[PDB]
RNA sequence: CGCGACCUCAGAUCAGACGUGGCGACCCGCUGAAUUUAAGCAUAUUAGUCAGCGGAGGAGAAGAAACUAACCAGGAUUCCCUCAGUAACGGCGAGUGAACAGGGAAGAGCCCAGCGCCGAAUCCCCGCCCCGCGGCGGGGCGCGGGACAUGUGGCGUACGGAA
RNA sequence: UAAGGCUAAAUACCGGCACGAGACCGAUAGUCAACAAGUACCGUAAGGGAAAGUUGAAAAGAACUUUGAAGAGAGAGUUCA
RNA sequence: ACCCACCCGACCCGUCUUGAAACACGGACCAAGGAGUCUAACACGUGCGCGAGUCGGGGGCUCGCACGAAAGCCGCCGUGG
RNA sequence: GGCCCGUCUCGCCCGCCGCGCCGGGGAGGUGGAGCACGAGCGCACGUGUUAGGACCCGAAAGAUGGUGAACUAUGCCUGGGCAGGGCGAAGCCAGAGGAAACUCUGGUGGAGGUCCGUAGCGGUCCUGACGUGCAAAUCGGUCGUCCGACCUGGGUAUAGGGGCGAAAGACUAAUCGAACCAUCUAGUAGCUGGUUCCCUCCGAAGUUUCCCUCAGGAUAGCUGGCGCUCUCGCACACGCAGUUU
RNA sequence: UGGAGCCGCCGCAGGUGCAGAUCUUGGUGGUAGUAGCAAAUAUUCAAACGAGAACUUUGAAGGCCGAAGUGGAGAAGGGUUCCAUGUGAACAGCAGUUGAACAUGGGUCAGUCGGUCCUGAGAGAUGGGCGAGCGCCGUUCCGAAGGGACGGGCGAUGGCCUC
RNA sequence: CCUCUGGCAUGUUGGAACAAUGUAGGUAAGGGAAGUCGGCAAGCCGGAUCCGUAACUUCGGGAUAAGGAUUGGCUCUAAGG
RNA sequence: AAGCAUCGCGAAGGCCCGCGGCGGGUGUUGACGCGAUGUGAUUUCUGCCCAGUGCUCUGAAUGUCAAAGUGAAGAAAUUCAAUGAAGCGCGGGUAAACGGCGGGAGUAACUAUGACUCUCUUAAGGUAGCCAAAUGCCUCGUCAUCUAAUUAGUGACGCGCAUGAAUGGAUGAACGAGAUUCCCACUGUCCCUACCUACUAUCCAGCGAAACCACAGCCAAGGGAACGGGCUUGGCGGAAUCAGCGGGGAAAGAAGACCCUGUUGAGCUUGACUCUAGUCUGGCACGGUGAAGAGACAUGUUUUUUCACUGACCCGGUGAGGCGG
RNA sequence: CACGAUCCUUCUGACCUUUUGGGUUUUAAGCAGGAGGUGUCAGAAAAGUUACCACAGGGAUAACUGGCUUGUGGCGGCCAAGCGUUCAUAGCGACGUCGCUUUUUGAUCCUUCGAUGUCGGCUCUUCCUAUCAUUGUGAAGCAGAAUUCACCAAGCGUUGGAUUGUUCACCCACUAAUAGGGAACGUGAGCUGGGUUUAGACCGUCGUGAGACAGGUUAGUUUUACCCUACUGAUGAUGUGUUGUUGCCAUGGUAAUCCUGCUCAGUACGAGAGGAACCGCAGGUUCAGACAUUUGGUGUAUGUGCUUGGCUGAGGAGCCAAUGGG
RNA sequence: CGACUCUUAGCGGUGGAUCACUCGGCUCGUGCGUCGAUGAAGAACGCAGCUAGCUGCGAGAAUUAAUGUGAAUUGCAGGACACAUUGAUCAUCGACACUUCGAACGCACUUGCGGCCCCGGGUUCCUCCCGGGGCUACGCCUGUCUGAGCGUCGCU
């Protein structure tokens, strides 16, 4: 029968992201001679809130080294950053917090975040809120580094690609109970139309594959192939094991 | 014409 | 580090031209159902049909055989009569379905590339004069521009052609 | 003799302009439409879509008198009616 | 043939149905409209013409068609069926 | 009886430019929509049977291409709106006790998808009113909620097997278990309904076998029409039967 | 009665004969002067006009809305409904001397009040890509995407070529 | 709920009656849910001040729990800047 | 709904759109996130079952498995052969995946029950809890209580037709226009009805519809398509009307929603039949350079394996601003 | 009786035909006979569900009534083996048998599918008798009291509640008795809507699932009368010359009911225990028909106080608050 | 007889059938076979002495010119004209004209904002200001001018 809620989120329309009040992307500084070879110094002009994001950001202003012009960025705030602090970054950057330097430089056991997945990408892994990666180990030839991500996975990475030292700010957000449905409503409203979520068991059998029945039951196994046409792929996708 | 009955009334019901 | 050829590319309210939308009975190119029939239905059928998009002309399309035939042979295309509801297709069911010959309507045939020869012998645009000018043409005259040898024009194309 | 090209004619024509005809219809017919019809009217919109011809030869369409606030009458007159 | 009286007779039509006055449906009344058509193909019957033939199409020749988009004629009379 | 073609069986001979895995015949069966001194062709009318809108009216559906979010659903942008009371959370003050830890008492403070309750938003019950209404869903009282997942204008986004859905198959312009408009379309109908003047003559069937057949067809039967061939009450008859012998 | 065409016979031709189709279009009854003209407390007296007054107007009294208004102003929507004079056919479910009816005329004046400008959510060309195609996507992305300015220089003209 | 400012003529009519049925309001002796599927409907309760407040509990509540008393008019007093 | 719990994804990714694009949404995002499902605050728990159906993990050790490619014979169409991807099989995991969770006999110095024993059986055989519950056929279960009387209410009992643990079990303060039962109060709910008010209805002036309508309209019985207004036989029958009334017109309303038939449909489902977007795999093409080696056949050919390379192709960054020597 | 068409396949068969411009060869195509099957067996290739449902129709066909039938249920005879201490028959009555009844349920499908509103309760009228009580009587295994059996007989009655949607059932209480039925299983334009029986939801069992369940639960629109008749009441009608009067009466209707107490009487009767009746007298039930002196109810005489908020400057006098309240 | 009801007829209403007409359709045929950036079709808004609609036209607006025709047009007015004169009125239509949207074109759809050249007032080129005029779409071809490139060369 129907195209199911889920198939519909792909068309955008109503399920697009809410992004009026969002303060910008939360990138790293782009690479250049100064970053590449020395270290450019900038100052943290302010620390900011960014709707739909648990991490706070940091307006960090540098000086463009070509035009007389004060360029500025939005770093995700490393925890313990503050205003009127300087934020050095580059190869020859000093290994202290809120200081973006290549993973290859920094020693083993070094905690980082906003870490570039591929060199020059401007900060992709570990940029959530209480999250960080740890630099495991370096292979000097091949110019590669092994990094342990917050998911647990131990991804291999180019030693050139940068990261900000320290963890992300605003950690332990998810320790607080929400309590009020209202409090949930107010969270997702500054994000996207994804909240009060209706269980496919509730639905009639035209709008979901679990729907219908004289008793709210699933009726088929809730685990499912991932060679599964969109419209059935519902429940537990490719679920290797399923229980507790 | 004249209304008479509702759709779900269906007057002379003998199930 | 200049200046000059060309090549490939831009920009001009550059000079002068064209194209855009409409109509849509007829016509050309795509696209393309389902009611329906089969006493059900899925192939089939309805149908290359309706709707959809494109482009034309006073008509369009086609057309001067990489054809028919198998004869003692016909000889572009289109149209009519016939072939013929035939050969063939088809859950060989429903149903569908041409062509050649034969007789008519009409009747008309041609041109390149190439291969070659000929001082590019060719073309376009400028400007001055004479005619002509409400379908921008003739003739002449200009060391006046450009196209063109990465090929223009005359001869010539299978019915043979050149010298 | 293919992989390049042009070509009138007999052929088509429910659109257009301009004509001619009919064993057709004759105002509930014939076109939706004989008329100020794709009009009025409806619908947000795509679209839908009517009804409606006839005094008399001639307007000669009733001067004037009278009742009534008037519409309406009663006489008079016009017309072959 | 208008009305009235009286005696006897006499349920409302249409329809489907084995069976309708039916407690089966349709029907307040009147006017106008309103449904076995045309084409094609087959078969049998009948009428006419010619007859081992028959045929007419299609085409053509005769006119500006008033009647004619008829009528007539054709080594096409038979390519062909 | 005979002849022609197919076919089989059995047989014995003929022929010549090419003698051959050549060609031709005979007898007896048996298949053929055949021949056995022709009847067709054309035109016209009638009936029947079909294919077509196909006697007229009738679906639920199906397909193509378009129009709508002025209602309503949800998102987003920008604006507007929400009496008076109750309860009294953290923090703060003082006083009293406590050896300390800290605890009591009185204040202050004003939290909350907090309570009452107006406007607002809603819509429980009376199964009240109304029920050819005021109204194609209204009215009255009674009710729920009333600082929050609150109410609400305008703008803007999502469109039909598509949207949107705190999920009722809800809502999508009085239309939704697939909107509306035009077309394909006069869609199909073994089923309802109707089917137009008179007289005359004849006059049925509801049984057969077959059928995805049982509300229909086919095929026999029963009917009518057209005839023909003969018969003889024209002193001069053969055959036939819902009998009997 | 009507006032302009029409019939008999022989042939041919057909959109050729109605009581029915919950048939179609138009008309007319009985029902019936019946149902009905009952939501939101309310009227009364005198006068004026006038053919005519339960309803107009004026005056007097008695009543209601009771500033979350039956008051005073806008938005959207309407589109002349506004104002005046006149009419009393029709319409305003009794009436009307009245009206938002009908017929005559009038009537909307801006640098400052708004449109106008900006951007919002979003919409949407170009380049580019897809696309049988009408087109669609995309809106910074596969762009040579600025035509502006200042200061200097050189030229040209227009001006008491001074400036 | 009553009033001024401002606004209206009772919401598309009037008059005469005061029957039954209704629609919308009220009241009822004694009993008090015996009514009815069912306390549906209506009735009780209601403000304030002063007392008083259970089970249970997520210790926040329950809670206006329940249950009681008072309330007018008049003439004074005291207390608050 | 908060809370709990699973599952997918490290971006040439998960999920999803789109006819197509070096297209798009999530995403101005990066696991304290995005996406997909269940359960449903708190408290307290959450038993066993991986046999079935799912999902998933591994994979030359290997059955089958297509097109191409390779060989074979053949005059050739060709046939036959070897080769062999995913997928199926084969083997592990998984129940907060769909789901599932027994039956006989005998046994205690009165009897009765049966702690106990014996078998037959499954993937286990229903655990904690809970109960005649919104779940119990028998059923008005039995006991108690509540009433004068209770098919109701409550509390107990439990071989429970057919309870039961995130198909969530047991609980539970606060809350509820939610479903019950009783008590106090209160009442016209009732015994049993009555009177009053307003607006109606009523009569009048003015104005003025509709549905419905074969004809019509008094009964009893008879027969009759088996309940007649009309027919038969009886009773009988008297203009024109007013206000009421709901017995009858099998009254009106709407071509019965039920049921059945139709070779009529639509919505939804799946182990129906026939397909299909999507996706997974293999082949050929765009598709190149070098190195090394390695087998297989043959006495060069093919298969290529692995490791580099960059020039296609891709991705990211930037106002392409310092690249390699 | 033991079996199978077209199409397709496959095998067998002939010095067979065709394989198209001709020839040779493979291949294919024909011709003829067997085999591979259609069991729905004269021969489609084919799963559910719908309570979200639709359309064409059907009384050719179910779910009511009503007809026919009466098995089954209900009621009643006949016979007489027994029971009844004794005695077939006071009361009973086996084994057998004959009937009626349509308040049981079945059969059946005639009527209605262009719809006859589908249970129960309330309310109201009328009929039947198959008589519970009441009147008059026969019988007894009737001494009295209590009683069962039968006859005439349907005049008059036959109640209040608890549980249940109920019909039915049961219990409490009263009573004279708490008999049984019918009228489209009387009665939805009379109500009600609790239950059945749409759509929303829960639970159990069943189903892979959509969904199912004479298994449980909860939430869920009850329209119209102004026509005709019938009934109720209301004006009138033809006649009598008109009018008025006082009257008669055809025909319709129709009504009274049952109980207690006292007395008879602690009497009859009886061993006693217990324990009547007729006539009187006093009252009450239910029903009917009136009425308002009295008691009660109503009360907008808007009568007369009293009182809230407001408003006429106040007093006095009043008014408003849909009847301000009392 | 009285009222009412039924029936028939007369006359009158209601209603618009019938019949008779037909500047319209329907069908068959003939000839021709023509739109547009020189701005189409279509839309809008205008225009009459009194004119709303239909038609006709475009700010020269129920039409101008021209040619043909030869006294009207007419609902009423008014007028013209010498109808022995280019001359009323029709017809034709070759000259002229043709508001705004629209392929639709400066960019936008408010009817809003502009740029660039020239002209008149304004100045006395002082730019402003006002008014007028002419340019200012996209695509594409042939040329033209200006250019770009560690594209391929040559000379210096
Ligand atoms: Mg649901
Ligand atoms: Mg599904
Ligand atoms: Mg064009
Ligand atoms: Mg079919
Ligand atoms: Mg059929
Ligand atoms: Mg079918
Ligand atoms: Mg075809
Ligand atoms: Mg077409
Ligand atoms: Mg051509
Ligand atoms: Mg050629
Ligand atoms: Mg030819
Ligand atoms: Mg033939
Ligand atoms: Mg074909
Ligand atoms: Mg040449
Ligand atoms: Mg050509
Ligand atoms: Mg007409
Ligand atoms: Mg007419
Ligand atoms: Mg007409
Ligand atoms: Mg006429
Ligand atoms: Mg007329
Ligand atoms: Mg006429
Ligand atoms: Mg006359
Ligand atoms: Mg039938
Ligand atoms: Mg029948
Ligand atoms: Mg009949
Ligand atoms: Mg009957
Ligand atoms: Mg019928
Ligand atoms: Mg009828
Ligand atoms: Mg007729
Ligand atoms: Mg014949
Ligand atoms: Mg026949
Ligand atoms: Mg036919
Ligand atoms: Mg149809
Ligand atoms: Mg279909
Ligand atoms: Mg109601
Ligand atoms: Mg009513
Ligand atoms: Mg009203
Ligand atoms: Mg549908
Ligand atoms: Mg038809
Ligand atoms: Mg049938
Ligand atoms: Mg006969
Ligand atoms: Mg005449
Ligand atoms: Mg005709
Ligand atoms: Mg008729
Ligand atoms: Mg009245
Ligand atoms: Mg005003
Ligand atoms: Mg006015
Ligand atoms: Mg009026
Ligand atoms: Mg009033
Ligand atoms: Mg009034
Ligand atoms: Mg009003
Ligand atoms: Mg009382
Ligand atoms: Mg009771
Ligand atoms: Mg009770
Ligand atoms: Mg209540
Ligand atoms: Mg409490
Ligand atoms: Mg789960
Ligand atoms: Mg498993
Ligand atoms: Mg299950
Ligand atoms: Mg247990
Ligand atoms: Mg009780
Ligand atoms: Mg219990
Ligand atoms: Mg379970
Ligand atoms: Mg478990
Ligand atoms: Mg369960
Ligand atoms: Mg009748
Ligand atoms: Mg009745
Ligand atoms: Mg009815
Ligand atoms: Mg029907
Ligand atoms: Mg139907
Ligand atoms: Mg059948
Ligand atoms: Mg179907
Ligand atoms: Mg399958
Ligand atoms: Mg050959
Ligand atoms: Mg259901
Ligand atoms: Mg069901
Ligand atoms: Mg549902
Ligand atoms: Mg029947
Ligand atoms: Mg004995
Ligand atoms: Mg029966
Ligand atoms: Mg009835
Ligand atoms: Mg008796
Ligand atoms: Mg009944
Ligand atoms: Mg009734
Ligand atoms: Mg009812
Ligand atoms: Mg109910
Ligand atoms: Mg339900
Ligand atoms: Mg009345
Ligand atoms: Mg006073
Ligand atoms: Mg008030
Ligand atoms: Mg008359
Ligand atoms: Mg007419």
PDB file of N, CA, C and O (backbone and C1' of nucleotides) in Angstrom, chain J residues 122-135:
ATOM      1  P     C J 122     -42.324  -4.772  32.294  1.00  0.00           P
ATOM      2  O5'   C J 122     -42.629  -3.230  32.045  1.00  0.00           O
ATOM      3  C5'   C J 122     -42.223  -2.269  33.031  1.00  0.00           C
ATOM      4  C4'   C J 122     -42.090  -0.890  32.433  1.00  0.00           C
ATOM      5  C3'   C J 122     -43.381  -0.230  31.983  1.00  0.00           C
ATOM      6  O3'   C J 122     -44.042   0.301  33.119  1.00  0.00           O
ATOM      7  C1'   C J 122     -41.742   0.017  30.315  1.00  0.00           C
ATOM      8  P     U J 123     -45.462  -0.282  33.558  1.00  0.00           P
ATOM      9  O5'   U J 123     -46.469   0.518  32.622  1.00  0.00           O
ATOM     10  C5'   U J 123     -46.346   1.943  32.466  1.00  0.00           C
ATOM     11  C4'   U J 123     -46.903   2.380  31.142  1.00  0.00           C
ATOM     12  C3'   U J 123     -48.280   1.851  30.798  1.00  0.00           C
ATOM     13  O3'   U J 123     -49.255   2.567  31.545  1.00  0.00           O
ATOM     14  C1'   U J 123     -46.872   1.658  28.922  1.00  0.00           C
ATOM     15  P     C J 124     -50.474   1.785  32.232  1.00  0.00           P
ATOM     16  O5'   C J 124     -51.363   1.354  30.985  1.00  0.00           O
ATOM     17  C5'   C J 124     -51.818   2.375  30.088  1.00  0.00           C
ATOM     18  C4'   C J 124     -52.558   1.803  28.908  1.00  0.00           C
ATOM     19  C3'   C J 124     -53.481   0.627  29.169  1.00  0.00           C
ATOM     20  O3'   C J 124     -54.741   1.087  29.619  1.00  0.00           O
ATOM     21  C1'   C J 124     -52.175   0.183  27.267  1.00  0.00           C
ATOM     22  P     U J 125     -55.754   0.069  30.276  1.00  0.00           P
ATOM     23  O5'   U J 125     -56.282  -0.774  29.039  1.00  0.00           O
ATOM     24  C5'   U J 125     -57.174  -0.136  28.126  1.00  0.00           C
ATOM     25  C4'   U J 125     -57.398  -0.985  26.907  1.00  0.00           C
ATOM     26  C3'   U J 125     -57.994  -2.357  27.137  1.00  0.00           C
ATOM     27  O3'   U J 125     -59.378  -2.309  27.450  1.00  0.00           O
ATOM     28  C1'   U J 125     -56.307  -2.493  25.505  1.00  0.00           C
ATOM     29  P     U J 126     -60.086  -3.579  28.104  1.00  0.00           P
ATOM     30  O5'   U J 126     -60.053  -4.648  26.933  1.00  0.00           O
ATOM     31  C5'   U J 126     -60.927  -4.554  25.811  1.00  0.00           C
ATOM     32  C4'   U J 126     -60.534  -5.602  24.811  1.00  0.00           C
ATOM     33  C3'   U J 126     -60.747  -7.036  25.270  1.00  0.00           C
ATOM     34  O3'   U J 126     -62.097  -7.472  25.154  1.00  0.00           O
ATOM     35  C1'   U J 126     -58.579  -6.818  24.401  1.00  0.00           C
ATOM     36  P     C J 127     -62.660  -8.611  26.136  1.00  0.00           P
ATOM     37  O5'   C J 127     -62.006  -9.939  25.550  1.00  0.00           O
ATOM     38  C5'   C J 127     -62.518 -10.488  24.324  1.00  0.00           C
ATOM     39  C4'   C J 127     -61.579 -11.512  23.731  1.00  0.00           C
ATOM     40  C3'   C J 127     -61.491 -12.845  24.451  1.00  0.00           C
ATOM     41  O3'   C J 127     -62.624 -13.644  24.126  1.00  0.00           O
ATOM     42  C1'   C J 127     -59.327 -12.110  23.858  1.00  0.00           C
ATOM     43  P     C J 128     -63.040 -14.862  25.073  1.00  0.00           P
ATOM     44  O5'   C J 128     -61.801 -15.839  24.932  1.00  0.00           O
ATOM     45  C5'   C J 128     -61.603 -16.618  23.749  1.00  0.00           C
ATOM     46  C4'   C J 128     -60.456 -17.542  24.002  1.00  0.00           C
ATOM     47  C3'   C J 128     -60.687 -18.487  25.164  1.00  0.00           C
ATOM     48  O3'   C J 128     -61.458 -19.588  24.703  1.00  0.00           O
ATOM     49  C1'   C J 128     -58.521 -17.523  25.284  1.00  0.00           C
ATOM     50  P     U J 129     -62.592 -20.216  25.634  1.00  0.00           P
ATOM     51  O5'   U J 129     -61.738 -20.991  26.724  1.00  0.00           O
ATOM     52  C5'   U J 129     -60.835 -22.010  26.279  1.00  0.00           C
ATOM     53  C4'   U J 129     -59.896 -22.383  27.386  1.00  0.00           C
ATOM     54  C3'   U J 129     -60.593 -22.945  28.621  1.00  0.00           C
ATOM     55  O3'   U J 129     -60.106 -24.247  28.879  1.00  0.00           O
ATOM     56  C1'   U J 129     -58.964 -21.338  29.216  1.00  0.00           C
ATOM     57  P     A J 130     -61.074 -25.495  28.750  1.00  0.00           P
ATOM     58  O5'   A J 130     -60.175 -26.662  29.352  1.00  0.00           O
ATOM     59  C5'   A J 130     -58.828 -26.855  28.881  1.00  0.00           C
ATOM     60  C4'   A J 130     -57.832 -26.726  30.009  1.00  0.00           C
ATOM     61  C3'   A J 130     -57.626 -25.334  30.601  1.00  0.00           C
ATOM     62  O3'   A J 130     -57.129 -25.458  31.928  1.00  0.00           O
ATOM     63  C1'   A J 130     -55.722 -25.948  29.335  1.00  0.00           C
ATOM     64  P     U J 131     -58.139 -25.662  33.157  1.00  0.00           P
ATOM     65  O5'   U J 131     -58.018 -24.283  33.938  1.00  0.00           O
ATOM     66  C5'   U J 131     -56.843 -23.952  34.696  1.00  0.00           C
ATOM     67  C4'   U J 131     -57.264 -23.396  36.028  1.00  0.00           C
ATOM     68  C3'   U J 131     -57.919 -24.399  36.979  1.00  0.00           C
ATOM     69  O3'   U J 131     -57.514 -24.187  38.327  1.00  0.00           O
ATOM     70  C1'   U J 131     -59.324 -22.546  36.694  1.00  0.00           C
ATOM     71  P     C J 132     -56.171 -24.834  38.897  1.00  0.00           P
ATOM     72  O5'   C J 132     -55.810 -23.850  40.095  1.00  0.00           O
ATOM     73  C5'   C J 132     -54.565 -23.962  40.800  1.00  0.00           C
ATOM     74  C4'   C J 132     -54.282 -22.702  41.587  1.00  0.00           C
ATOM     75  C3'   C J 132     -55.470 -22.036  42.270  1.00  0.00           C
ATOM     76  O3'   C J 132     -55.796 -22.673  43.509  1.00  0.00           O
ATOM     77  C1'   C J 132     -54.240 -20.413  41.089  1.00  0.00           C
ATOM     78  P     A J 133     -57.334 -22.833  43.981  1.00  0.00           P
ATOM     79  O5'   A J 133     -57.748 -21.339  44.349  1.00  0.00           O
ATOM     80  C5'   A J 133     -57.048 -20.645  45.394  1.00  0.00           C
ATOM     81  C4'   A J 133     -57.517 -19.218  45.502  1.00  0.00           C
ATOM     82  C3'   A J 133     -59.018 -19.001  45.655  1.00  0.00           C
ATOM     83  O3'   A J 133     -59.440 -19.127  47.014  1.00  0.00           O
ATOM     84  C1'   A J 133     -58.164 -17.525  44.023  1.00  0.00           C
ATOM     85  P     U J 134     -60.855 -19.816  47.385  1.00  0.00           P
ATOM     86  O5'   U J 134     -61.929 -18.769  46.849  1.00  0.00           O
ATOM     87  C5'   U J 134     -62.053 -17.482  47.473  1.00  0.00           C
ATOM     88  C4'   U J 134     -62.864 -16.541  46.616  1.00  0.00           C
ATOM     89  C3'   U J 134     -64.228 -17.035  46.185  1.00  0.00           C
ATOM     90  O3'   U J 134     -65.104 -16.974  47.292  1.00  0.00           O
ATOM     91  C1'   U J 134     -63.177 -15.956  44.374  1.00  0.00           C
ATOM     92  P     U J 135     -65.854 -18.288  47.758  1.00  0.00           P
ATOM     93  O5'   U J 135     -67.155 -18.283  46.836  1.00  0.00           O
ATOM     94  C5'   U J 135     -68.068 -17.167  46.878  1.00  0.00           C
ATOM     95  C4'   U J 135     -69.140 -17.288  45.821  1.00  0.00           C
ATOM     96  C3'   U J 135     -69.911 -18.594  45.778  1.00  0.00           C
ATOM     97  O3'   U J 135     -70.898 -18.635  46.805  1.00  0.00           O
ATOM     98  C1'   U J 135     -69.376 -17.900  43.578  1.00  0.00           C
TER      99        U J 135
END
